[PDB]
Amino acid sequence: MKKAVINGEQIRSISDLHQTLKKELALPEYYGENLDALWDALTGWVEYPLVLEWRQFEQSKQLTENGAESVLQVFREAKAAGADITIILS
Amino acid sequence: VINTFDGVADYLQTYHKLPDNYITKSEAQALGWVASKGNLADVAPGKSIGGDIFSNREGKLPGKSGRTWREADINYTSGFRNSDRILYSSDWLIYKTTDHYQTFTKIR
């Protein structure tokens, strides 16, 4: 039962987002910090069940120029792929 | 066990498939694999994850209508997975990454 929190109002860069995920998800130190690295971590590293709570999504969507959406898309595809991931968008 | 960049690369080109020491993520799971445990070697000795579709999400690899990409772990023996992967396409273009997909190098 792994829990991960993202306070959107505090994300000022796509890099902020990837470094935040690295910590909240306990990703490997070599974490590529990109969409492909994220898919690999969610499907071949991260522990489940997983609960991702993304607060102020809209605000973080601004400072990442729709990059936040692409990140969210990976979590959703990992989910549709079988990963026990609960996503909270608030 | 063939799990080096050129060993797997040459094998893919010559036999149009991965060596026998490779199993997909779902196959490994059916065998008891729990990524967060790093027990792959315990559940499937000599095996490495590989063969799954690679979505090329950052668009770093050459995309073409009808071409699908797949990936496989390189230099893995046991424990937690590393940052090395070999990427191969349906029309046999071969690339590698050693920095968890940040950058790629064409090797075939």
Question: What is the CATH number for A26?
Answer: 3.30.370.10
Give the gap in angstroms from C-alpha A55 to the nearest C-alpha of chain B: 24
Partner-chain contact A28 B83, CB within 8 Å: yes
Joined together, the tokens standing for residue B7 give 């060993």
Instruction: Domain count for chain A, please give it.
Output: 1
Active site residue B16: no
What are the residues whose beta carbons fall under 8 Å from the beta carbon of A16, sequence distance 6 or more? Answer: A10, A63, A64
B85-94, long-range: CB within 8 Å, 24+ apart, which pairs? Answer: B85/A40, B86/B5, B86/B8, B86/B9, B86/B12, B86/B50, B87/B54, B87/B61, B88/B9, B88/B12, B89/B61, B89/B62, B90/B66, B91/B64, B91/B67, B92/B12, B92/B13, B92/B16, B93/B61, B93/B62, B94/B9, B94/B12, B94/B13
Distance CA B78, CA B84 (A): 14
Domain boundaries, position A74? 1-90
Partner-chain contact A35 B54, CB within 8 Å: no
- The structural domains of chain B, with segments of one domain joined by +, span 1-108
What are the residues whose beta carbons fall under 8 Å from the beta carbon of B25, sequence distance 6 or more? Answer: A43, A44, B49, B52
Active site residue B71: yes
**Resolution of this entry, Å:** 2.1
CATH topology (fold) of B1-108: Nuclear Transport Factor 2; Chain: A, (3.10.450)
What are the residues whose beta carbons fall under 8 Å from the beta carbon of A12, sequence distance 6 or more? Answer: A63
